[PDB]
Amino acid sequence: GDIVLFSGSKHVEFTDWGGTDWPSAYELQPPYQTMPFDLNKNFEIKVDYSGADIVLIFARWEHGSKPQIWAQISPYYVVDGTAVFTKEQIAKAYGSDDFSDLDYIGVKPLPSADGMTVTKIVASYTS
């Protein structure tokens, strides 16, 4: 299956690492929002974007003894203005493919004069 998480034209301005705030094109908080795709499946996240380089963040906030995970990943690869992020890649960054503690998923730009525009985000299942 292919699951559209967003389609349209979402623009994010972010011209440098100036502030402590870091704006996103797309965010999910699994503990708080019903999920549009199944993290347990072998998935890839595909993002059609332009204007800035792009990063996917899987994060777990710090809770007692467990540290904050900020699994920021560059695309597994980019093709044709589409970034592809894989579960295996995400898992390697996150430390595991156990997402039972996952607090945050964010798609974010790196600094850009023009800002980043996302047109489509798709989760597809791979096997």
24 φ, ψ to 5°? -120, 155
DSSP string, 57-73: EEEE--BTTBPPEEEEE
Q: Which residue matches tokens 């301005």?
A: 13
Helix (H, G, I), strand (E, B) or coil at 88: helix
Closest CA to 115 of 54, 56, 58, 74: 54
Q: What is the DSSP letter of 76?
A: S
Task: Name the residue range of residue 71's domain.
Answer: 1-127
Give the integer Cα–Cα distance in Å for 104 and 81.
24
Q: Say which experimental method was used.
A: X-ray
User: Which residue type does 110 have?
Assistant: L
The experimental resolution of this structure, in angstroms, equals 1.8
What lies within 8 Å, CB to CB, of 101 at 6+ separation is 60, 63, 66
Pairing type for strands 69-73 and 77-79 reads unpaired
Dig out the tokens for 117 from the structure.
């525009």
Looking up residue 60, the CATH number of its domain turns out to be: 2.60.120.1070
CB 3 within 8 A of CB 121: no
Q: Distances in Å between the alpha carbon of 27 and those of 105, 106, 107?
A: 5, 4, 6
Structure token digits, residue 47: 């993002």
Closest CA to 77 of 106, 107, 51, 47: 47
Sheet with 82-86, strands from edge to edge, namely 2-12, 116-125, 43-50, 82-86, 77-79
Residue type, 103: D
Domains in the chain: how many in total?
A: 1
